[PDB]
Protein backbone atom coordinates (compact mmCIF):
# COMPACT_ATOMS: atom_id res chain seq x y z
CA UNK A 1 0.00 0.00 0.00
CA UNK A 2 2.01 3.00 -1.18
CA UNK A 3 0.72 6.62 -1.28
CA UNK A 4 3.72 8.58 -2.66
CA UNK A 5 1.79 11.48 -4.26
CA UNK A 6 3.56 14.32 -2.39
CA UNK A 7 2.62 17.45 -4.49
CA UNK A 8 3.08 19.93 -1.60
CA UNK A 9 6.83 19.39 -1.38
CA UNK A 10 7.70 21.56 -4.38
CA UNK A 11 7.68 25.26 -3.64
CA UNK A 12 8.48 26.92 -0.32
CA UNK A 13 5.60 29.10 0.92
CA UNK A 14 3.36 26.00 0.74
CA UNK A 15 2.15 24.27 3.94
CA UNK A 16 1.48 20.55 3.49
CA UNK A 17 -1.72 19.05 4.86
CA UNK A 18 -0.22 18.43 8.38
CA UNK A 19 1.60 21.79 8.20
CA UNK A 20 5.05 20.46 7.43
CA UNK A 21 6.67 23.01 5.05
CA UNK A 22 8.61 20.16 3.32
CA UNK A 23 11.08 22.23 1.28
CA UNK A 24 12.77 23.35 4.51
CA UNK A 25 12.82 19.75 5.71
CA UNK A 26 14.51 18.64 2.47
CA UNK A 27 17.20 21.29 3.01
CA UNK A 28 17.94 19.78 6.42
CA UNK A 29 18.45 16.47 4.53
CA UNK A 30 21.06 18.15 2.31
CA UNK A 31 23.46 18.60 5.20
CA UNK A 32 23.59 14.76 5.25
CA UNK A 33 25.12 14.97 1.75
CA UNK A 34 27.97 16.95 3.37
CA UNK A 35 31.11 15.70 5.16
CA UNK A 36 30.66 14.96 8.88
CA UNK A 37 31.82 17.65 11.34
CA UNK A 38 31.91 17.08 15.14
CA UNK A 39 32.23 19.73 17.89
CA UNK A 40 32.84 19.04 21.62
CA UNK A 41 32.50 21.89 24.18
CA UNK A 42 34.53 21.31 27.36
CA UNK A 43 35.42 23.66 30.22
CA UNK A 44 38.97 23.86 28.80
CA UNK A 45 37.66 24.95 25.35
CA UNK A 46 35.57 24.00 22.28
CA UNK A 47 37.18 21.70 19.65
CA UNK A 48 35.89 21.45 16.04
CA UNK A 49 36.84 18.66 13.58
CA UNK A 50 35.76 17.95 9.97
CA UNK A 51 36.49 15.43 7.18
CA UNK A 52 37.93 17.13 4.06
CA UNK A 53 36.71 14.52 1.49
CA UNK A 54 39.55 15.28 -1.04
CA UNK A 55 38.50 14.02 -4.52
CA UNK A 56 41.90 14.05 -6.30
CA UNK A 57 45.53 14.17 -5.15
CA UNK A 58 46.13 17.17 -7.48
CA UNK A 59 43.61 19.39 -5.60
CA UNK A 60 45.54 21.36 -2.97
CA UNK A 61 44.37 20.30 0.52
CA UNK A 62 44.63 23.80 2.05
CA UNK A 63 41.95 25.20 -0.25
CA UNK A 64 39.22 22.97 1.15
CA UNK A 65 38.21 25.10 4.15
CA UNK A 66 35.52 23.47 6.27
CA UNK A 67 36.75 25.19 9.47
CA UNK A 68 37.13 29.00 9.33
CA UNK A 69 37.58 31.87 11.82
CA UNK A 70 34.55 34.23 12.23
CA UNK A 71 36.72 36.25 14.68
CA UNK A 72 39.46 35.36 17.17
CA UNK A 73 36.90 34.35 19.79
CA UNK A 74 34.48 32.45 17.47
CA UNK A 75 35.14 29.86 14.74
CA UNK A 76 32.77 27.85 12.50
CA UNK A 77 32.80 24.32 11.05
CA UNK A 78 30.39 23.98 8.13
CA UNK A 79 28.85 20.95 6.46
CA UNK A 80 26.61 21.21 3.42
CA UNK A 81 26.81 23.22 0.22
CA UNK A 82 30.16 25.07 0.43
CA UNK A 83 28.84 28.05 -1.50
CA UNK A 84 25.89 28.95 0.74
CA UNK A 85 28.23 28.56 3.71
CA UNK A 86 30.47 31.22 2.25
CA UNK A 87 27.61 33.70 2.35
CA UNK A 88 26.68 32.77 5.95
CA UNK A 89 30.31 32.90 7.18
CA UNK A 90 30.50 36.39 5.58
CA UNK A 91 27.39 37.72 7.32
CA UNK A 92 28.91 36.48 10.54
CA UNK A 93 32.26 38.09 9.88
CA UNK A 94 30.64 41.44 9.11
CA UNK A 95 28.32 41.27 12.16
CA UNK A 96 31.14 40.53 14.59
CA UNK A 97 33.01 43.49 13.13
CA UNK A 98 29.93 45.74 13.14
CA UNK A 99 29.54 45.03 16.89
CA UNK A 100 33.13 46.03 17.55
CA UNK A 101 32.59 49.27 15.71
CA UNK A 102 29.29 50.17 17.36
CA UNK A 103 29.92 48.85 20.90
CA UNK A 104 33.70 48.31 21.23
CA UNK A 105 33.17 44.77 22.53
CA UNK A 106 33.32 41.15 21.31
CA UNK A 107 30.00 39.49 20.32
CA UNK A 108 29.04 36.38 22.32
CA UNK A 109 28.87 33.14 20.34
CA UNK A 110 25.10 33.13 20.80
CA UNK A 111 24.58 36.58 19.37
CA UNK A 112 26.70 35.71 16.31
CA UNK A 113 24.60 32.59 15.71
CA UNK A 114 21.46 34.63 16.11
CA UNK A 115 22.85 37.03 13.54
CA UNK A 116 23.60 34.39 10.87
CA UNK A 117 20.29 32.69 11.74
CA UNK A 118 18.41 35.88 10.99
CA UNK A 119 19.83 35.76 7.43
CA UNK A 120 18.86 32.08 7.10
CA UNK A 121 15.27 32.77 8.21
CA UNK A 122 14.90 35.31 5.34
CA UNK A 123 14.68 32.45 2.77
CA UNK A 124 10.94 32.38 3.41
CA UNK A 125 10.58 35.55 1.30
CA UNK A 126 10.03 37.20 4.69
CA UNK A 127 11.45 40.54 3.38
CA UNK A 128 10.67 42.40 0.13
CA UNK A 129 14.40 42.82 -0.69
CA UNK A 130 15.31 41.33 -4.13
CA UNK A 131 18.77 40.10 -3.00
CA UNK A 132 17.63 37.27 -0.68
CA UNK A 133 17.93 33.64 -1.76
CA UNK A 134 14.46 32.09 -2.19
CA UNK A 135 15.73 28.61 -1.30
CA UNK A 136 16.42 27.80 2.33
CA UNK A 137 20.21 27.74 2.82
CA UNK A 138 21.65 24.21 2.55
CA UNK A 139 24.38 24.50 5.15
CA UNK A 140 24.55 23.65 8.86
CA UNK A 141 27.18 25.50 10.84
CA UNK A 142 28.65 24.61 14.23
CA UNK A 143 29.81 27.84 15.89
CA UNK A 144 32.15 27.46 18.86
CA UNK A 145 33.81 30.25 20.82
CA UNK A 146 34.97 31.39 24.26
CA UNK A 147 32.68 34.20 25.48
CA UNK A 148 31.69 35.79 28.82
CA UNK A 149 29.95 32.49 29.72
CA UNK A 150 33.08 30.52 28.77
CA UNK A 151 33.44 27.86 26.08
CA UNK A 152 30.14 27.54 24.12
CA UNK A 153 29.20 25.53 20.95
CA UNK A 154 26.00 26.49 19.12
CA UNK A 155 24.64 24.47 16.15
CA UNK A 156 22.63 26.20 13.38
CA UNK A 157 20.49 24.39 10.80
CA UNK A 158 19.01 25.38 7.42
CA UNK A 159 15.72 26.22 9.24
CA UNK A 160 17.70 28.88 11.08
CA UNK A 161 17.09 27.42 14.52
CA UNK A 162 20.20 27.54 16.72
CA UNK A 163 20.82 25.75 20.04
CA UNK A 164 23.79 25.30 22.36
CA UNK A 165 25.04 21.72 22.16
CA UNK A 166 27.65 20.18 24.50
CA UNK A 167 28.63 17.96 21.57
CA UNK A 168 27.04 17.76 18.11
CA UNK A 169 27.89 16.13 14.79
CA UNK A 170 26.54 17.60 11.55
CA UNK A 171 26.99 15.77 8.28
CA UNK A 172 26.68 12.42 6.52
CA UNK A 173 27.40 10.23 9.52
CA UNK A 174 25.86 12.56 12.05
CA UNK A 175 23.41 9.84 12.99
CA UNK A 176 25.66 7.27 14.63
CA UNK A 177 28.39 9.78 15.28
CA UNK A 178 25.91 11.49 17.58
CA UNK A 179 25.14 8.14 19.16
CA UNK A 180 28.83 7.52 19.80
CA UNK A 181 29.25 11.09 21.03
CA UNK A 182 26.45 10.53 23.52
CA UNK A 183 28.30 7.56 25.01
CA UNK A 184 31.77 9.24 25.10
CA UNK A 185 30.83 12.77 26.21
CA UNK A 186 31.18 13.52 29.92
CA UNK A 187 31.02 17.18 31.03
CA UNK A 188 34.34 16.92 32.90
CA UNK A 189 36.48 15.81 29.88
CA UNK A 190 39.53 17.98 29.15
CA UNK A 191 40.02 19.26 25.60
CA UNK A 192 42.87 16.79 25.15
CA UNK A 193 40.49 13.88 25.75
CA UNK A 194 37.85 15.47 23.52
CA UNK A 195 40.23 15.96 20.59
CA UNK A 196 41.17 12.29 20.85
CA UNK A 197 37.56 11.22 21.22
CA UNK A 198 36.31 13.32 18.31
CA UNK A 199 39.05 12.01 16.00
CA UNK A 200 38.28 8.43 17.12
CA UNK A 201 34.64 8.98 16.14
CA UNK A 202 35.65 10.56 12.80
CA UNK A 203 37.99 7.66 12.01
CA UNK A 204 35.06 5.28 12.47
CA UNK A 205 32.61 7.33 10.35
CA UNK A 206 35.04 8.36 7.56
CA UNK A 207 35.38 5.87 4.68
CA UNK A 208 39.10 6.65 4.10
CA UNK A 209 41.76 5.89 6.74
CA UNK A 210 42.43 8.99 8.85
CA UNK A 211 45.52 10.94 7.73
CA UNK A 212 46.57 14.47 8.57
CA UNK A 213 45.54 15.57 5.08
CA UNK A 214 41.94 14.26 5.29
CA UNK A 215 40.95 16.04 8.57
CA UNK A 216 40.79 19.67 9.76
CA UNK A 217 40.81 20.30 13.52
CA UNK A 218 40.58 23.56 15.44
CA UNK A 219 40.31 24.63 19.07
CA UNK A 220 39.38 27.87 20.88
CA UNK A 221 40.70 27.50 24.47
CA UNK A 222 39.90 30.59 26.65
CA UNK A 223 43.36 32.19 26.69
CA UNK A 224 44.22 31.36 23.07
CA UNK A 225 42.44 32.56 19.90
CA UNK A 226 41.02 30.16 17.26
CA UNK A 227 43.86 27.76 16.47
CA UNK A 228 43.97 25.29 13.58
CA UNK A 229 46.18 22.30 14.28
CA UNK A 230 48.98 22.33 11.65
CA UNK A 231 49.94 19.14 9.85
CA UNK A 232 52.70 18.56 12.39
CA UNK A 233 50.32 19.00 15.33
CA UNK A 234 47.65 16.89 13.63
CA UNK A 235 50.22 14.17 13.00
CA UNK A 236 51.04 14.02 16.72
CA UNK A 237 47.38 13.67 17.78
CA UNK A 238 46.47 11.15 15.05
CA UNK A 239 49.52 9.05 16.03
CA UNK A 240 48.14 8.85 19.58
CA UNK A 241 44.92 7.26 18.23
Amino acid sequence: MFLTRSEYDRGVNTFSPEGRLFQVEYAIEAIKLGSTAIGIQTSEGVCLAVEKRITSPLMEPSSIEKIVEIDAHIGCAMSGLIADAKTLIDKARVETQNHWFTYNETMTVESVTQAVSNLALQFGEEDADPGAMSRPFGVALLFGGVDEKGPQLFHMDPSGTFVQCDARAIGSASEGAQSSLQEVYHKSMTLKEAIKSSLIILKQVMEEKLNATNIELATVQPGQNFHMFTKEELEEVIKDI
Partner: protein, 213 residues
Protein backbone atom coordinates in the same frame (compact mmCIF):
# COMPACT_ATOMS: atom_id res chain seq x y z
CA UNK B 1 15.62 82.76 10.19
CA UNK B 2 14.56 79.64 12.11
CA UNK B 3 17.56 78.68 14.24
CA UNK B 4 17.29 75.00 15.04
CA UNK B 5 19.15 75.33 18.38
CA UNK B 6 18.96 77.41 21.62
CA UNK B 7 21.32 77.15 24.63
CA UNK B 8 19.17 75.80 27.45
CA UNK B 9 22.20 75.95 29.73
CA UNK B 10 23.11 73.69 32.62
CA UNK B 11 26.35 72.13 33.84
CA UNK B 12 27.17 68.43 34.45
CA UNK B 13 30.05 66.98 36.48
CA UNK B 14 31.27 63.42 36.83
CA UNK B 15 33.95 62.13 39.21
CA UNK B 16 35.20 58.56 39.02
CA UNK B 17 36.61 56.70 42.03
CA UNK B 18 38.34 53.40 42.73
CA UNK B 19 34.95 51.79 43.46
CA UNK B 20 32.40 54.59 42.91
CA UNK B 21 31.34 56.96 40.15
CA UNK B 22 29.54 60.25 40.91
CA UNK B 23 27.63 62.18 38.20
CA UNK B 24 25.99 65.45 39.25
CA UNK B 25 24.04 68.21 37.56
CA UNK B 26 22.13 71.48 37.97
CA UNK B 27 18.34 71.45 37.81
CA UNK B 28 17.72 74.74 35.99
CA UNK B 29 16.62 74.97 32.34
CA UNK B 30 17.10 78.52 31.10
CA UNK B 31 16.22 79.87 27.68
CA UNK B 32 17.83 83.27 27.14
CA UNK B 33 17.67 85.36 30.31
CA UNK B 34 14.46 83.67 31.54
CA UNK B 35 14.40 80.56 33.77
CA UNK B 36 12.11 78.00 32.16
CA UNK B 37 12.03 75.66 35.17
CA UNK B 38 14.09 75.34 38.35
CA UNK B 39 13.51 71.56 38.61
CA UNK B 40 14.81 69.73 35.51
CA UNK B 41 17.53 67.28 36.60
CA UNK B 42 20.01 66.75 33.74
CA UNK B 43 21.16 63.28 34.96
CA UNK B 44 19.36 60.15 33.67
CA UNK B 45 19.96 56.54 34.81
CA UNK B 46 20.61 54.39 31.74
CA UNK B 47 21.26 51.14 33.64
CA UNK B 48 22.08 50.10 37.21
CA UNK B 49 25.79 50.66 36.59
CA UNK B 50 25.59 53.82 34.38
CA UNK B 51 24.15 57.38 34.45
CA UNK B 52 24.18 59.79 31.49
CA UNK B 53 24.41 63.54 31.96
CA UNK B 54 23.50 65.84 29.10
CA UNK B 55 23.65 69.64 28.80
CA UNK B 56 23.00 71.87 25.78
CA UNK B 57 19.83 72.13 23.75
CA UNK B 58 17.30 70.33 25.97
CA UNK B 59 15.33 69.16 22.96
CA UNK B 60 18.37 67.23 21.74
CA UNK B 61 18.95 65.87 25.25
CA UNK B 62 15.42 64.55 25.48
CA UNK B 63 15.70 62.89 22.07
CA UNK B 64 19.13 61.45 22.82
CA UNK B 65 18.03 60.02 26.13
CA UNK B 66 15.05 58.40 24.42
CA UNK B 67 17.31 56.96 21.68
CA UNK B 68 19.91 55.63 24.14
CA UNK B 69 17.16 54.13 26.30
CA UNK B 70 15.62 52.40 23.30
CA UNK B 71 18.94 51.10 22.06
CA UNK B 72 19.81 49.81 25.50
CA UNK B 73 16.60 47.74 25.41
CA UNK B 74 17.43 46.46 21.93
CA UNK B 75 20.91 45.40 23.05
CA UNK B 76 19.31 43.58 25.96
CA UNK B 77 16.80 41.75 23.79
CA UNK B 78 19.35 40.80 21.14
CA UNK B 79 22.38 40.01 23.32
CA UNK B 80 20.61 38.90 26.55
CA UNK B 81 22.94 41.05 28.72
CA UNK B 82 23.00 44.70 29.93
CA UNK B 83 25.14 47.17 27.98
CA UNK B 84 28.33 47.91 29.91
CA UNK B 85 29.37 51.55 30.46
CA UNK B 86 32.08 51.06 27.83
CA UNK B 87 29.56 49.90 25.26
CA UNK B 88 27.12 52.72 25.94
CA UNK B 89 29.94 55.13 25.39
CA UNK B 90 30.87 53.62 22.05
CA UNK B 91 27.25 53.44 20.89
CA UNK B 92 26.70 57.08 21.87
CA UNK B 93 29.81 58.03 19.94
CA UNK B 94 28.36 56.47 16.78
CA UNK B 95 24.88 57.90 17.41
CA UNK B 96 26.25 61.42 17.79
CA UNK B 97 28.40 61.18 14.63
CA UNK B 98 25.34 60.10 12.67
CA UNK B 99 24.30 63.72 12.68
CA UNK B 100 27.75 65.23 11.98
CA UNK B 101 26.08 67.25 9.17
CA UNK B 102 23.09 68.64 11.30
CA UNK B 103 24.45 68.16 14.82
CA UNK B 104 23.03 67.43 18.27
CA UNK B 105 24.06 70.40 20.46
CA UNK B 106 24.55 68.26 23.58
CA UNK B 107 27.66 67.99 25.72
CA UNK B 108 27.33 64.51 27.23
CA UNK B 109 29.08 62.78 30.13
CA UNK B 110 28.48 59.07 30.91
CA UNK B 111 29.66 57.97 34.33
CA UNK B 112 29.38 54.45 35.66
CA UNK B 113 31.09 51.36 37.07
CA UNK B 114 33.19 49.31 34.61
CA UNK B 115 33.22 45.48 34.41
CA UNK B 116 36.29 45.28 36.71
CA UNK B 117 34.13 47.09 39.30
CA UNK B 118 36.17 50.29 39.08
CA UNK B 119 34.43 53.59 38.26
CA UNK B 120 34.79 55.00 34.75
CA UNK B 121 33.80 58.42 33.36
CA UNK B 122 33.49 58.87 29.58
CA UNK B 123 33.19 62.43 28.24
CA UNK B 124 31.98 63.22 24.72
CA UNK B 125 32.29 66.26 22.42
CA UNK B 126 29.07 67.35 20.64
CA UNK B 127 30.09 65.38 17.52
CA UNK B 128 30.94 62.22 19.48
CA UNK B 129 34.65 62.12 20.28
CA UNK B 130 34.89 60.07 23.49
CA UNK B 131 37.69 59.90 26.06
CA UNK B 132 37.75 57.90 29.30
CA UNK B 133 38.58 60.57 31.90
CA UNK B 134 38.91 60.36 35.72
CA UNK B 135 36.94 63.58 36.32
CA UNK B 136 35.12 65.74 33.79
CA UNK B 137 32.87 68.80 33.97
CA UNK B 138 30.66 69.61 31.03
CA UNK B 139 28.22 72.38 30.27
CA UNK B 140 28.11 76.14 30.81
CA UNK B 141 30.42 76.00 33.82
CA UNK B 142 32.87 73.46 32.47
CA UNK B 143 35.33 76.31 32.36
CA UNK B 144 34.80 77.27 35.98
CA UNK B 145 34.44 73.73 37.47
CA UNK B 146 37.15 71.84 35.56
CA UNK B 147 40.15 73.74 36.88
CA UNK B 148 39.22 73.18 40.53
CA UNK B 149 38.68 69.46 40.06
CA UNK B 150 42.06 69.28 38.33
CA UNK B 151 43.85 70.90 41.28
CA UNK B 152 41.98 68.96 43.95
CA UNK B 153 41.29 65.55 42.29
CA UNK B 154 44.35 65.55 39.99
CA UNK B 155 46.81 67.21 42.40
CA UNK B 156 48.13 69.28 39.46
CA UNK B 157 50.51 72.23 40.07
CA UNK B 158 50.75 71.12 43.74
CA UNK B 159 54.30 70.39 44.97
CA UNK B 160 55.13 68.36 48.12
CA UNK B 161 51.49 67.18 48.55
CA UNK B 162 50.76 63.42 48.88
CA UNK B 163 48.37 61.66 46.47
CA UNK B 164 45.38 60.05 48.26
CA UNK B 165 42.72 58.01 46.39
CA UNK B 166 39.44 59.95 46.42
CA UNK B 167 36.79 58.67 48.83
CA UNK B 168 33.05 58.84 48.25
CA UNK B 169 32.81 61.28 51.18
CA UNK B 170 35.60 63.61 50.09
CA UNK B 171 34.16 63.62 46.57
CA UNK B 172 30.61 64.35 47.68
CA UNK B 173 32.05 67.26 49.66
CA UNK B 174 34.03 68.40 46.63
CA UNK B 175 31.13 68.13 44.21
CA UNK B 176 28.86 70.10 46.48
CA UNK B 177 31.47 72.83 46.83
CA UNK B 178 32.38 73.20 43.15
CA UNK B 179 28.69 73.57 42.22
CA UNK B 180 28.23 76.17 44.99
CA UNK B 181 31.05 78.19 43.42
CA UNK B 182 29.52 77.97 39.90
CA UNK B 183 26.12 79.00 41.14
CA UNK B 184 27.70 82.24 42.32
CA UNK B 185 29.54 83.08 39.11
CA UNK B 186 27.70 81.33 36.23
CA UNK B 187 24.29 82.80 35.52
CA UNK B 188 23.06 79.59 33.89
CA UNK B 189 23.82 77.17 36.79
CA UNK B 190 21.73 77.29 39.99
CA UNK B 191 18.54 76.17 41.80
CA UNK B 192 19.58 72.66 42.89
CA UNK B 193 22.18 69.91 42.48
CA UNK B 194 21.24 66.23 41.97
CA UNK B 195 24.25 64.03 42.88
CA UNK B 196 23.92 60.44 41.61
CA UNK B 197 26.41 58.01 43.15
CA UNK B 198 26.83 54.72 41.27
CA UNK B 199 28.33 51.96 43.44
CA UNK B 200 28.00 48.16 43.39
CA UNK B 201 24.72 48.53 45.32
CA UNK B 202 23.36 50.92 42.66
CA UNK B 203 22.52 54.54 41.81
CA UNK B 204 21.55 56.64 44.85
CA UNK B 205 20.14 60.12 44.20
CA UNK B 206 20.86 62.94 46.69
CA UNK B 207 19.59 66.50 46.08
CA UNK B 208 21.15 69.59 47.74
CA UNK B 209 19.98 73.16 47.20
CA UNK B 210 22.20 75.69 45.39
CA UNK B 211 21.21 79.40 45.48
CA UNK B 212 18.12 80.36 43.50
CA UNK B 213 19.43 83.27 41.35
Amino acid sequence: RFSPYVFNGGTILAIAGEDFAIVASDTRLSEGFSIHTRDSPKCYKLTDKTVIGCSGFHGDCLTLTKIIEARLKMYKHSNNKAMTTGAIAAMLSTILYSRRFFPYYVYNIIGGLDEEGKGAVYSFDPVGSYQRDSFKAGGSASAMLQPLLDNQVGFKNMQNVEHVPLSLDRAMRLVKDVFISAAERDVYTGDALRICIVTKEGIREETVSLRKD
